């Protein structure tokens, strides 16, 4: 009878309707603060050449650089200047000047 087939469609349809959701990722562009390199292909013998061959277990150790990660805050003022005294319709042709300057300590402590 079809009742068995019908309930089986129902169970399969139900199970595939379940939420199996995953997160999105905002990937910020790397600045080059951390860099890695890869292994390279290497030429090897066409015929065996080594002597005293032996099997064995090995444990490889690397130099411990012990990275210390911490939080740092940076403060700066971006300045921009243009020839406004000629009028907005013309200042555009005379270019623009820009500079990035550090915030003096007294401003970081007494104002920020």
């Amino acid at each position: 009878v079809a009742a068995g087939h019908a309930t089986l469609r129902e169970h399969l349809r139900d199970i595939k309707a379940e939420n199996t959701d995953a997160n999105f990722y905002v990937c910020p562009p790397p600045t080059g603060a951390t860099v890695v390199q890869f292994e390279q292909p290497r030429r090897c013998p066409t015929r065996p050449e080594g002597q005293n061959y032996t099997e064995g277990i090995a444990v490889v150790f690397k130099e411990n650089i012990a990275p210390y990660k911490f939080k740092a805050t940076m403060y700066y003022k971006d300045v921009t200047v243009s020839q406004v005294w000629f009028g907005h319709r013309y200042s555009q042709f005379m270019g623009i000047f820009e500079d990035r300057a550090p915030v003096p300590f007294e401003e970081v402590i007494d104002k920020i």
């Binding site: 910020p28 562009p29 790397p30 600045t31 603060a33 951390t34 860099v35 890695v36 390199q37 890869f38 292994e39 990275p67 990660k69 971006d78 921009t80 623009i96 820009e98 500079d99 990035r100």
Partner: protein, 50 residues
């Protein structure tokens, strides 16, 4: 401009096909000021297929 020359041992080689205990940062771009004024193009490394 040319700066200096590193030995191949100066950079951390990533293990063959799977690696762990690797340290990283949440890189923050800090774009140059000229990208807003002069609207010069920001370096984006070598081109991916995408």
């Amino acid at each position: 401009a040319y700066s200096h020359q590193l030995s191949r041992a100066d950079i951390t080689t990533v293990s063959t096909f799977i690696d762990l205990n690797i340290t990283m940062l949440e890189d923050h771009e800090f774009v140059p000021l000229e990208v807003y004024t002069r609207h010069e193009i920001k370096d984006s490394g070598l081109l991916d297929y995408t």
